Amino acid sequence: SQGIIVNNMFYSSGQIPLTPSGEMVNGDIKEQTHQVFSNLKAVLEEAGASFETVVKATVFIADMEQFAEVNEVYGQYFDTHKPARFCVEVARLPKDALVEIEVIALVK
Amino acid sequence: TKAVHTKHAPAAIGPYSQGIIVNNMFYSSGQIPLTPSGEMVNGDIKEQTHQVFSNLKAVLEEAGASFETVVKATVFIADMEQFAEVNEVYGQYFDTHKPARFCVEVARLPKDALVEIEVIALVK
Amino acid sequence: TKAVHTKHAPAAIGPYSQGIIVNNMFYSSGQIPLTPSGEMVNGDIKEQTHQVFSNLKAVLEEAGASFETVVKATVFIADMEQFAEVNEVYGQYFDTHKPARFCVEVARLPKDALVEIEVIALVK
Amino acid sequence: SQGIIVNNMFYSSGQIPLTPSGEMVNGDIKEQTHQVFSNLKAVLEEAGASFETVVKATVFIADMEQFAEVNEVYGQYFDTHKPARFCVEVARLPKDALVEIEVIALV
């Protein structure tokens, strides 16, 4: 269970920077944010949504000072569509994760 | 409601998986109706809500906070029609003190669970 | 609760002042108990709430949406105890369909308004 | 008018780029964002809060692509202390206004 659909809206659970084989990626927050997005692509597809249909993203971050770096990667995946809303929250995250992202997306 | 399962993404983390204090504020992890023996209270939703609140009391106490200092609660619920029952228990913990904000959200919860609550509270 | 005012800043807005549609979602303005004549409604909280819901139907239909496509509601209320009375009127309009998410917030409303609701809804 | 205090928390109403006399500020979105921050400063002081006790900011913006310049000004007032949470929301704002901000803060 990587999320839930409720009248035409997909609410994802949080994706953390693990490979599908289940271990943490090596690299900085920007690389972790790549893995997270890569994980989100997969769950969006499975739900019948996509990045274009994301209406809200919640970024949980270990350190608010690394927001600019996460945001550089956010703007790569959301370059031709900008979710109408996003939030950034300081959170304690599973060992070594500097970022976790959940989304809310329309089911096409 | 319908669940989304894929093998091309790792398992997800419930975002409020660990409590944290930032700037005198305790943001709890989501409390599910687990007992100290680590089994679910598999009873009706009012029983499960009591257990959630018991777990909330502990994490608050541990964080130097209390129900009195809770400013926001978020209730994750399996079925929105069950809100009325959960809220009857909520009102026993938040009786003369009522958090200034609350939210209720349909979620897919860990196996069994009908209710999960997280809170945000001032540290004393 | 205590209201804050300073001459050293201008009057605030209350951010849900006007509606908008973005990426097939309708984000409604906050709806108060004004009548179509412009009168603030002469009643208790339940009367006011009904007027809110009539103003909501109007903005939802006008946006190509309906109560049944509302995915989130936010209820602004002067006292959290009055929520049950608002919620009786809420449950009438969200009878068969229930929004997956809703929040309730203490807030200072325009004079005489004891309730204000905004919604977010899917424009199919 | 400008916010409420409940249980030691100040919940500001949204501040737009008006001067205290009530005229809209003229200039780019950065200049607008400065005016909003001056207004928030004054409302926070009155509430018995400060930028340092801010726990959440909500930024209502006319368009997402201008968040870059809003954020540069946000970073000036929240430099030594960053709120634990912030949200950015596309909104229809009172005319001329490209940005509007509310905050939640400990008293």
The reply to whether B77 falls in a domain is yes
Tokens of C87: 């919620």
CB of A52 closer than 8 Å to CB of C25: no
When divided into structural domains, chain A yields a total of: 1
Catalytic residue among C9, C11, C13, C103: C103
Specify the residue for token string 């997306």.
A105
Q: Which residues of C touch D45 (CB under 8 A)?
A: 6, 8
Of C18, C112, C14, nearest in space to C59 by CA: C18
CB of D42 closer than 8 Å to CB of D71: no
Q: Which residues of A touch D65 (CB under 8 A)?
A: 82
Report how many Cβ contacts below 8 Å link chain A to chain C: 28
CATH number at residue C39: 3.30.1330.40
* Binary contact (C102, B103; C-beta < 8 A): yes
| CA torsion through residues C36, C42, C46, C47, sign | negative
Please give the Cα distance from C6 to C24 (Å, whole number).
39
Please give the Cα distance from B74 to B117 (Å, whole number).
6
Please give the Cα distance from A33 to A74 (Å, whole number).
8
> How was this structure obtained?
X-ray
Non-local CB neighbours of D74 within 8 Å, separated by 6+ positions: D33, D57, D59, D86
Non-local CB neighbours of D70 within 8 Å, separated by 6+ positions: D29, D30, D33, D59, D61, D88, D99
**D79 Cα to chain A: minimum distance (Å):** 10
Range 60-89 of D in CB contact (< 8 A) with A: 64-65, 82-89
**A59 Cα to chain D: minimum distance (Å):** 10
Q: Tell me the structure's resolution in angstroms, rounded to a single decimal.
A: 2.1
Q: Which of B20, B21, B22, B23 to mutate to test the interface with D (most CBs of D within 10 A)?
A: B23
The reply to whether C47 falls in a domain is yes
Residues β-bridged to residue C40:
C34
CA atoms within 13 A on the CB side of C89: 20
Angle at C30 between CA C29 and CA C34, to 5 degrees: 110
The reply to whether C58 falls in a domain is yes
* Binary contact (A20, B27; C-beta < 8 A): no
For the beta carbon of residue C82, count every other beta carbon within 10 angstroms.
18
Angle between helices C45-62 and C83-93 (to 10 degrees): 40
Query: Which regions of A1-108 does DSSP assign to beta strands (E)?
Result: 3-6, 9-12, 54-61, 85-90, 99-106
The reply to whether B32 falls in a domain is yes
The reply to whether C102 falls in a domain is yes
The reply to whether C8 falls in a domain is no
Q: Does A25 contact C at CB distance below 8 Å?
A: no
Residue A8: C-alpha distances to residues B2, B114, C70 (Å)? 10, 22, 11
The reply to whether C9 falls in a domain is no
Catalytic residue among B20, B80, B103, B106: B103
Specify the residue for token string 């196996």.
B111
Q: What is the domain range of residue C110?
A: 20-122
Residue ranges of the alpha helices (H) in B4-80?
45-62
DSSP 8-state secondary structure symbol assigned to residue A18: B
Tokens of C33: 């108990």
* Binary contact (B108, A20; C-beta < 8 A): no
Q: Is C103 a catalytic residue?
A: yes
CB of A51 closer than 8 Å to CB of A101: no
* Binary contact (C102, B100; C-beta < 8 A): no
Backbone region of residue B43 per phi and psi (left: phi > 0; alpha: psi in -120 to 50; beta: other values):
beta
